[PDB]
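> Could you send the Endolysin,Rhodopsin,S-arrestin prediction when you get a chance?

Sure thing. Input:
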Amino acid sequence: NIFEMLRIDEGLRLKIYKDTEGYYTIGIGHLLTKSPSLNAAKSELDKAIGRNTNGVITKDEAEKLFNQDVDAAVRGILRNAKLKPVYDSLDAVRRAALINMVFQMGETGVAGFTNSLRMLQQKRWDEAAVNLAKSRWYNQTPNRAKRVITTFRTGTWDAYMCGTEGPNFYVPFSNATGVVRSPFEYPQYYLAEPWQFSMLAAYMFLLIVLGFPINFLTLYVTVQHKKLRTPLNYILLNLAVADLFMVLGGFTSTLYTSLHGYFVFGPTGCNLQGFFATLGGEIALWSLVVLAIERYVVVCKPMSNFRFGENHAIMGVAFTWVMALACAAPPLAGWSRYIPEGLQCSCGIDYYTLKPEVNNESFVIYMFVVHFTIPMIIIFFCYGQLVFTVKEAAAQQQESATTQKAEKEVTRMVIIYVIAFLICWVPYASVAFYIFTHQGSCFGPIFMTIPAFFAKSAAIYNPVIYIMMNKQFRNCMLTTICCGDDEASATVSKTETSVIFKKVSRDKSVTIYLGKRDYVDHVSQVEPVDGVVLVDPELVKGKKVYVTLTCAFRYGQEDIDVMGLTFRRDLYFSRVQVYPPVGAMSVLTQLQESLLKKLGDNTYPFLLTFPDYLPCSVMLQPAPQDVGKSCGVDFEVKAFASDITDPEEDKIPKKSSVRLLIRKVQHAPPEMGPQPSAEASWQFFMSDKPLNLSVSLSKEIYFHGEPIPVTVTVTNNTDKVVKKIKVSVEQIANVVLYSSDYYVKPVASEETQEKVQPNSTLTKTLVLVPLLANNRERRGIALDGKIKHEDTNLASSTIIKEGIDRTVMGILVSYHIKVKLTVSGFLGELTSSEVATEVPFRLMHPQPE
Ligand SMILES: *[C@@H]1O[C@H](CO)[C@@H](O[C@@H]2O[C@H](CO)[C@@H](O)[C@H](O)[C@H]2NC(C)=O)[C@H](O)[C@H]1NC(C)=O
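Output:
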């Protein structure tokens, strides 16, 4: 347009400069003053801008000086008697050309052209152009003139077009000089100085040297180590493959072209290089999106770990390739296109050129919204909510120091993930959007190379930031350069009567003793862990023996979950110093007295109490096909010796340490509650007549193996018939870790086909048998904790202490009887209305003699 004409012709200067005539000018052709003094020129500038510039101004202030000049130029023309009829006759493109003449020479200067202005009015475009070309004006600056003259002749912007537009390519350079040639056939060295091509060759070589091994090692090591093979890591493996396509297909070809200075492989090579570079980048993009989604759901909700198998991971990796091809395929298919970008040694999508045939307009918007903004929102939302959740969780437990340092590591890596994503895709998003809005303006080849730097650099630092920073991957990669617990490999539980059991450590310095594995949990109080620890004085000398009580909520795998930017949450933790003893135990138990006399002098007692806000020992049931999936709450009593002081728990010596799993179990209380009775009445929209139902049980509390009678009285006063009645025992498993989540899986059910007619009643008692044996080989069933691998029963109903301050975190189980009714629908026989009501009951272990 007019702005781009005069900006390129005159040139935009931020400071004051002398023009060809030698007069003080600033910005685009703005005369400050004719005064000879340099200070006088700055003074006339200062008043124009409105502040103390000191011969330096911005472009927006210069755009204001230009607008006042154009608004006044349209006047001086209309004011002039010779210029106005010409101005009125000529169209908007040729009017811009006339303003250029008046802007440069002035009102009196343009008035000297009589025959030129005459022929333009008469629509003689051929004769007026020769007139302007043979004049003094052309001889002075034929560079500027010829662009203005061609405008009069053609009536187009072809003269003021930004760069040479070929059919298969776009070069950001003017062919006015005539030096522009095809990037497929001839060298492009006229664009920038030849050393910058060898610079790119050195840069693209560096990305191959660094990129190929880093990404290849990710895949190579995972084949060797079976540990790394996990559904969650599948998305991180996709990132390695994604980055390899950029290196192999993209950077290797881009290297060879940057060697010679132009694109040797032709349009065929440009399509495939542009395809792989786009695909490899777009796969890498959505991999991090799916990774962000996967990390958000898996950690926050421990139930989802169970649900997340190979199928869900494959679904994530496939989705990536679908969205990747959504970006990469259409330029090949013809929507937009693949052309050489920047120095034209590297091919990429066409964001800068507006081509209406291939519709770059829709593709860039499609790119900006679908393939940029949506990944940006999701990643910032997922990792943003992820820190928000951990910040909330760490705020609850301020006592556990391990949960505090994790939150520190979480916030660290997320900020790095933000920075990694921002450095990569913002340059393209800024530039392509700027070019789309500012398309009238011109941009060089180096302008497009700056975003190309960062996205191609992401093939290096995204592997490092996402993979190398992860602890499980980092450790395995070290063992690869190293080219390669085993010594001891002994961890057994023994037993002797005097019934007591013990366990010896690996180094056999610290030996622990305990009374019983199952500790009875009452409502008011809890039965504490009682026992002793035999310490070897020779092996443990000048060291610190400790004992712990670890209540840990366990979900998923030890390796990958800890790698997952956080680790499994320790629910409760306690510590006591065993040796050397500080003071002594005020009162011992009958067990401790026996073991002290039985064992030698180096034995020391300990006692570990439980608070009232802890859950029971509960684990979720895995399916037979599910091997590595593991989730549940469990209690662990550990003992160890260490040189380091009390605070260090996360890191301890494995050889000195010894541990034994225990249970916290609730037996059924002596008081069986009142006879459960539920009652409800139901109606319809068309039919307003009532339907009464009354459920009744025998006991409030039931035992495992005990039959549950459900007495149901269906009183039918309505017009419809009841087809069948179904009773169901349903197991509510309320999981509280980062959030409260209710999950209902029916454990047992019985039904009957007895029909109930209108104005007729039926009383029926159906027995249900809630046993695990029938429910074996299922998913998500809550079970009582099993010592080792032994047979266990369905999870006991968890009783919470009345009136407590802290929220109970863990797996909280509850049962109820759902009496389901199937009634014939009013519209049709096939139509049906399922009605149901619930009543709670307890299922727990009996108290032994
Ligand atoms: C930029 O201008 C040059 C010089 O005019 C073009 O090169 C000529 O293109 C014409 C097209 O018909 C050929 O007939 C001539 O043989 C070419 N000249 C020479 C010396 O080879 C050039 O094609 C323009 N740029 C591009 C890339 O099209």
